[PDB]
A paper describes a structure:
Type II restriction endonucleases typically bind and recognize palindromic sequences as dimers, but the unusual biochemical properties exhibited by SgrAI suggest the formation of a higher order oligomer, containing altered enzymatic properties. A mechanism involving domain swapping is proposed to explain the unusual allosteric properties of SgrAI via association of the domain swapped tetramer of SgrAI bound to DNA into higher order oligomers.
A new crystal structure of the type II restriction endonuclease SgrAI bound to DNA and Ca2+ is now presented, which shows the close association of two DNA bound SgrAI dimers. The crystallographic asymmetric unit contains two such tetramers. Residues 25–30 of each subunit comprise a linker, or hinge loop as it is referred in domain swapped structures, in the domain swapping, as these residues take on a different conformation in the swapped structures than in the previously described unswapped structures. The crystals were grown in a solution containing 50 mM CaCl2, and two Ca2+ are bound in each active site at positions found previously. The symmetry within each tetramer shows a small deviation from perfect 222 symmetry, where a total of three 2-fold axes occur orthogonal to one another. Analysis of the active sites of all SgrAI structures solved to date (Dunten et al. 2008 and current work) shows very similar placement of all groups including the DNA in the various crystal structures, indicating that only a single conformation of the enzyme has been determined, which we have argued to be the low activity conformation.
Author numbering:
A (entry chain A): 2 to 24, 31 to 339
B (entry chain B): 2 to 339
The structure:
Amino acid sequence: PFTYSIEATRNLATTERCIQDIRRSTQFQLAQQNMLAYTFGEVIPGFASAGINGMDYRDVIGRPVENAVTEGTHFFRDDFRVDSNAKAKVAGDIFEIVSSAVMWNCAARWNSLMVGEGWRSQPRYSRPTLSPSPRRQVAVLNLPRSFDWVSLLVPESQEVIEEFRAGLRKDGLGLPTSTPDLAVVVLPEEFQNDEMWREEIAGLTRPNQILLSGAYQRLQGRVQPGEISLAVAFKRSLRSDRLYQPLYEANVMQLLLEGKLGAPKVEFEVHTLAPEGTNAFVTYEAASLYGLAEGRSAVHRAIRELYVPPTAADLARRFFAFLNERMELVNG
Amino acid sequence: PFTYSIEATRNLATTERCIQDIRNAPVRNRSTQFQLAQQNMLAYTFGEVIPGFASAGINGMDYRDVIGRPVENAVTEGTHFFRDDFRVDSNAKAKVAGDIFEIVSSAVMWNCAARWNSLMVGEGWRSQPRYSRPTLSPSPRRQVAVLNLPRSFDWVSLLVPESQEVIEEFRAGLRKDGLGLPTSTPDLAVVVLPEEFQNDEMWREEIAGLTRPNQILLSGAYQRLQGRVQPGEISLAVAFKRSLRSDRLYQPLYEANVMQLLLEGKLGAPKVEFEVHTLAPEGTNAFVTYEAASLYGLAEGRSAVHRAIRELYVPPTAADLARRFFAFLNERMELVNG
DNA sequence: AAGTCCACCGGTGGACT
DNA sequence: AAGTCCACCGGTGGACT
Ligand SMILES: [Ca+2]
Ligand SMILES: [Ca+2]
Ligand SMILES: [Ca+2]
Ligand SMILES: [Ca+2]
Ligand SMILES: [Ca+2]
Ligand SMILES: [Ca+2]
């Protein structure tokens, strides 16, 4: 009608409406795997030029989205547009994938020394002092979406845990396990002469991406409860509500690995580039609840540290020093 | 030059640039252009309506639609006044939709508590709308307070000082070892009404709408109760999450665990009831996650281990939300002597 | 008072069917 | 393949200063 009317409008057939609709809604996809291959095809931060190794880690992790934005602008001009939720999702995966690659190369360089091939000198990092041994080799495992960390355990340990859950599921309870982003594990005895674990990679090409992202498959059902040496959760920035998955999961890991399988203190740390204030530091001082609730065990922190890598080299240095220390707990 | 050059462009004086910014845009930390004024939206949309205590049409409507109505009205106003210029980020809608889900639902529970309290002090059972009359023996010591808790809150501050000292002395022990056990907060706490307030009419009045004074009454209520609740008088804790993601399940799971360690473990309280409300579970993932046993209960090793989170609840309508809460009170408040 | 903190969640790329 | 599931985080309104 001349004066607008909701009733009249609601009564029109679809094809009689004044506006005809002729249209996920995403327009330009951030191809994150392509982005890694492009920006980090030939660079693993902390193992490249002193410039990249020493650079503000936030700038490094941010480079691929920046390069992708520049690419998009070139090809699509003033039509180019991506949602902040895209950038957010990709930036996070990139933070995780890249740091896990730094750690992979530290692991390779450390394995190469454990096995008696000496200590690679480029770039220069202080030579670990621990006495070398094939049995002190480690694997860095970037764990996939949907993983259950329990699947790393030798089958006998899964049974122990499974039985324990049975008792619970019978009464409507359970104790699901999810997953940290990453786990470093002592390399299984059977793999200790395999060459692959000692080779540093040149960059995140697609083949190398697959290598790092699928390495967990090779160790599934092979790790002793005590041989899970470090768990890491990466969160590129924090918010107060986003802190708890790693805190909770570390608690569950300590309960099962320390409590039910008698393993040493489980080391679980969080990495972020933007703690956005200081409360997360207080939050992650929380004592491990299992250790508290029962009396037999010395109580320690669920999360050992909230770490803010300044540079890629500092991340590399910190892992090395951790290995140099944590691996002493393993007979050579 | 004919072929675009980044350096030539850099060298351009600002008055020589090809694009001339003429916005006169005030430079700020944030790039927001229109704010969703959430307290204003609550007032406009629910000024005269508390869902579950309004019209048959509202009480029985899909609760997703009720909760989504303030943002929808807001978008209407916005496109009316600002036409093509009106844009807000999905992140603004997420923030405001979240707070609205929690504030609205907490207001439904406030009205329930009032109607409940009215019955408990012997003033009978209201009928508009119609809810099943409670079978539990009325008593003024079975009144409850619904507390929408503030951002930054620490739930331990509700507890009577005698109980807070136990906790602090426990934490002091932990600190000598370089440990802590911080506590955060659930969105909402239902607590037994302290004696001193059991004759206060303000706990028996139902509110007509979320006008700004009512918003403030509800959101400020916790202050009145700070330091006056016994450990075992914390009857229900609720976290509201309008939708779920697998990574966003854990604050309430963790906090419920901490509440149970301290309240049940250290203060002898009975099972701590703690539940999540969502309108969008996105699968069965979270229902499995929340079957998790209370970690405290386990590790120590006594019988009758229970879940940390009692239930993941998905409110079909506001009416159902009220019914459930009434049903809960009816069963839970029998643990309290008349 | 501009700035900082707090806690809100929805749109995303890739794995999987 | 057409769809669902997973787990990523940054922009936000209001409190507090
Ligand atoms: Ca991963
Ligand atoms: Ca899974
Ligand atoms: Ca992560
Ligand atoms: Ca609140
Ligand atoms: Ca606080
Ligand atoms: Ca909430």
